[PDB]
Amino acid sequence: GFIAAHAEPWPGAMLHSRGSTPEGSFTLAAEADARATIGRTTAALPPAPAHVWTPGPLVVTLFSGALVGRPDLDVLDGANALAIQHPDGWEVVQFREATLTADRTWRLEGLLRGQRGTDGIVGPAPLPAGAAVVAIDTALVAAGLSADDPGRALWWRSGPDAASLAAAPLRPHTFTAAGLRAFPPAHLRAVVTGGGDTSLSWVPRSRLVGTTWPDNGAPIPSGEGLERYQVTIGPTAAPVRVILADTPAATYTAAERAADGIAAPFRVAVSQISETTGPG
Amino acid sequence: GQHVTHNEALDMIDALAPRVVLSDSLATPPPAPPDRSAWIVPPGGSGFGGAGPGQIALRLGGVWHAITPAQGARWRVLDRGAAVIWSGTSWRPADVSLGSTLGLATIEATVTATGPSVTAPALIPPRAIVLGVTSWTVQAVTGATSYRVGVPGEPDKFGASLGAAPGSSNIGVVGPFATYAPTDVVVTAEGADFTGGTIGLAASVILPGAPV
Amino acid sequence: GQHVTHNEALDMIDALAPRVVLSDSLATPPPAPPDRSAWIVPPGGSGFGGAGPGQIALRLGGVWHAITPAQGARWRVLDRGAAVIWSGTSWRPADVALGSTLGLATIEATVTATGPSVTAPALIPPRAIVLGVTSWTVQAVTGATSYRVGVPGEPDKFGASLGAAPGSSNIGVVGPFATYAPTDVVVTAEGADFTGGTIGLAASVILPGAPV
Amino acid sequence: GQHVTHNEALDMIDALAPRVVLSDSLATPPPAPPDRSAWIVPPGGSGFGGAGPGQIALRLGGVWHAITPAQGARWRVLDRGAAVIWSGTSWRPADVALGSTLGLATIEATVTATGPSVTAPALIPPRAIVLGVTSWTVQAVTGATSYRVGVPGEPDKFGASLGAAPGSSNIGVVGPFATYAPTDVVVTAEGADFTGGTIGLAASVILPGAPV
C-alpha cells in the first residue's frame, strides 16, 4: 500500500503507523524520508488512447517539488510516471514530458495509457478535474503490510514522527493491489458468427508482468494467477448473459439470444474478474 | 514486440502511407496538428516541425516530428486542394482536383439499337460537363457500321465513327467541347441499320459546385 | 523486434503503398534501380523481373520484390508520365502529363459585393484552361437580383445571370470555351445595386504548366 | 507477428491504401464482395455495414470491415467511375468515368534546331486529345527571338511568339480546343536563327475514351 507523504515544510522522518482500531492503537508500519513530490490536477481528461502518446494538456500544480520534461525514451524504460488519484487503481501515466506553465503548474504531455491497465481505470471513468498526482519516488512507502491487512480499513496514522493521532492524520484505509491484478482488459477479439456465435477471444493481458508483446519469442505470461474475463452485454448494463471465462475463447450461442435479448454487434466490455481475487 | 510497441508501429505505418496533408505554407504550423495528420512544411518552414523545409510536420503525442517525404507517395495538399506527389527534390504538383466538388454522376442506359438510329436515353443535366459518352456494344448490331454517338443534331460532333462491333466498348469523347448545357446524346448507325444490336451508354456528367 | 524487423515493415509500406513507378517499359528491369524503387514489369517482360509481368517488382538493395499491386493504388510511370492505377485486376492509365502536369488552380475569390460592380481577384493563371468558374453567395446580396460573373468589361462571359440569393453556389461555367490566357474575373449586379452582399468564387483552372 | 498477425497488418495495408471502392448504393452489402476490395456502404445502409453507414466495408477473409474514412480519404468509386475523395465531412467527387482511361504515350523529344525553320516529329496519335503543347529549350538557340511552334503551315495554333532562348520553357495550352487529329508541331521561327540550339518539345498526349 503506497503512502507518499506531502509534508508541509517539515524536516524529519515521517512516521506512518497503522492501527486497525478506530480509537488509534497504531503500530508502526512505515517511515517516510521527507515531503514526497506530489501534484494537484487542475484539469479533467477523457481517457487517452491506450499505448500511444496523447498530448492532452494536463495541468498539474505540484504540491511539492517540480516535474521534469524529458525524452520519451527514458519514459519508455520508465522515468516520467506519475500516479494520479483515481477510482480503483490510481492511474499512472508514462507521459513523455511535462511542460512548465507556472511555478507549480506543469503540463503533462504525450500521456501514455494502458500500461499495466493504466487505461483500465480510465475507460469507465474519465479523470476528475482535481486529483492527487504522485511521482514514483523513494519517499513512497509500500512495505510493512501483512497479507491480511488489504481489504480492511485499518486506520493509518499518516504524519510526522512527532505528530500522533489527530496530529498525524489517522485515516481508515484499505489497499487492493493484489485485487488490481490483470488490470489491462484481456485483448478482445469478439468474432460474431452465424447463430450469434460470438467468440469473445480474450488473450490474457497481465498487469504484474506488464502488457508484454511477444518479442524475439517472448510471449505474454500470466502472473495474475487465473482470470475469468467477463463479457458485458451491449443492450443492458447488467449483462443479460453473464459469462466470466477462465478460457480466453467464449463462443456465444443462438439460444441465449433467443431466450433473452442479445444484439448481434453488441458492445462487449471486458470486466477483468479474477479467480485469484475479484474484478481486477 | 517489447522493442517496438504495436502502437509505435502503427504510427510509423500511418505516416509512411501517403497522407493527404494541408500545406498552408506558414512559417509556423497550426497550433494543434492532429495525431496521424500533418501540415506540409514549405521551403523556409520554421518553428515546431520546422526540421527540414519541404518536409511534412506531423504531431504525434505532442511532438511534431517532421516526416521525411517519400518519393512516389502522394502527400496531396488539402489546403490548396492540390495533388502534390513528392518528386524527391520538390513538392511536384500532380493533377489537381474546391468547396464545390465537380461531381460525377454518370448516367447508364442500355438502349437496344433499333431501326436506323436511337437517341440515347442517358441524359446530360444542365450544368453537367461531358468528358465523354460510352457506346458499349452489348449485342452485335445487325448491319450497323458505326456508333455515331453525337450531341443531338450532330452525330459527327464527337465520336462520329466508333466501330459498332460486338464486344467493343466504343467510348467517344467530347474533348474540345465540354457540354455543360443539357444534351440528350443521339446515337445513329453510320448510314446503317441499328436493329439487332444493343448499346450500353454512360454519359459523363460533371457538376461543378457540388456539395461535399 | 527480431520477430518482425523494422525493415520488413518499412519495405512493406514502401512497396505496397502507391508509388510512382520508374518503369521504362523494358522487357528487363534495370540492373541497378534505386533503393525502394518500384518498377512494374511489362507484359512479355524477359530477363529479370521476378514479379510476373503485370506485377510490380520493387528493388530493395538489389532484391526485386514480387509484389502483387494493391487495388486502387496509383502507380504512375515516371517514364510515361501516365498515371497507371491498378484496379486489383488490370492496369489502367488514368486521366493525365507529357511534362505538363495539369494543376487545377483552386482559386477562391471572396469579394464583398459593393456599389454596382466589383472585380474578383481570381486572375486566371497564365496558360491555364478554365473548367468552371463557380460562384457562391457568401451573404445575401441586397438589391442585386442576380450575379453577373464574367471577365472585366463583360458581365456575360460565363454565368451571365446567376444568383445573388444567399448561400447560392450558382455556376458560371466557362464550359466548352476555356480562357487559357490570364484574365481577371468581374462580378456585377443584375440591373441593380451590388452593395450589402458577399460573393464567393470557385475558379477551377487546370494548367499544364509543370514538368514531369 | 503472433500478437498482431502479419495478416492483420496486410488487411490494414489494403484498408490504408486508396482503394477502388464500389458504390453500388445497396442498403444491404452484397453477399460476396471481392476480397481485398472495399464495397462502400451507402449512408443509411441497412443490415450489414451497419456500423458507420457511409463507411467502406472491405471484405477480408469474408469479413467486411467498415473503414472509417479520414480527411482527404480518396476512394475511387468503380460504379460512378469517379475518384471520390471523402473530405472528412462527407464524400467529395474529383473533377473528371465510363471506364474511359486517358492513355498517355511519352513524346518528349529534343529537337535539334538547325536553321530558322525546324520540324518537330511529335505527330499526335489519331483520336488523341491534346490538352496542351509542352515547350522547353534545351540548348541555346543562337540568333533566336521567337518560337513559332504549331501545326506546319499554321504555327499560330500554339504560341508563335514564344521567346526562343536557352533553357526557356514555353509550356502552354493550345487554346480551349484539344487536337484529337494527328499533327506535327513544326518549330518555325519569326526571323529567328535556330541554329546551334536544341528544343525540348512534347505535346500532352491524352487518349480519352479508351477502355481500361
Place this chain on the structure above:
Amino acid sequence: DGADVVWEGPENCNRYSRISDWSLSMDHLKNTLPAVQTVSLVVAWFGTDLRAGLCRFEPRIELRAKRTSIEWIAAGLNRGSATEVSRDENDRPAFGSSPADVSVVRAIMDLKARGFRVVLYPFVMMDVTADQALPSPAGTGAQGAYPWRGRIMPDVTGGRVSDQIAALMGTAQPDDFTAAVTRNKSGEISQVN
C-alpha cells in the same frame, strides 16, 4: 494564504524552542521576581479617531488572513470579519490585534496557581492612520497617525458632548454578548465564541 495550509508559525512564540513565549516569559519573570504581583493584562483594544463619539471602540485583526484553528470575536468581530491592524510597517502600523477571547480566559487560568494575582486592565489604544489632519480632541478635532489614549474629547456640540460620550460607550448588557464557550477533547477551553 499561499497554497494548502502549512501548520507552522506558532503564535505568541518567537522562541527557538517553539513553545509559546507566553508562560515561558512568566517562568523567567517568576524566577527573577519574588513578589509576582505584576499582572497587568493590558488588552490591545482598537479604537479609531481622536474625536469622541465619532470614534468607535471596535477591535480589528492582526492580519486579514493568517488563518488559525483558534478564532477571535471581540465585540462581535471575527477573525474573518475584521481588518488588519498589524501590517508590517512599510507605512502601515504594526499595532497588533486584540487577544482572542479564549486567550484571555486561558491567561487568567495560567496566571492563577502561579502565585500571580490576576488583575485585568482594560486598555484601548486608538491607532487611526494618517492622511487626515492633526489628531485633536477638540478645536480642530481632526485625526492623525497616532491618537493617545484618553486624549479623546467631544467637540461636535456642547449640548451633544453627553450624546457623543454615550455613542462612544454604547449601551452594553451581559446578555447582549453570548459566550459560546467550547471545550476541547482535553476539556480546556478550545474556542470561546
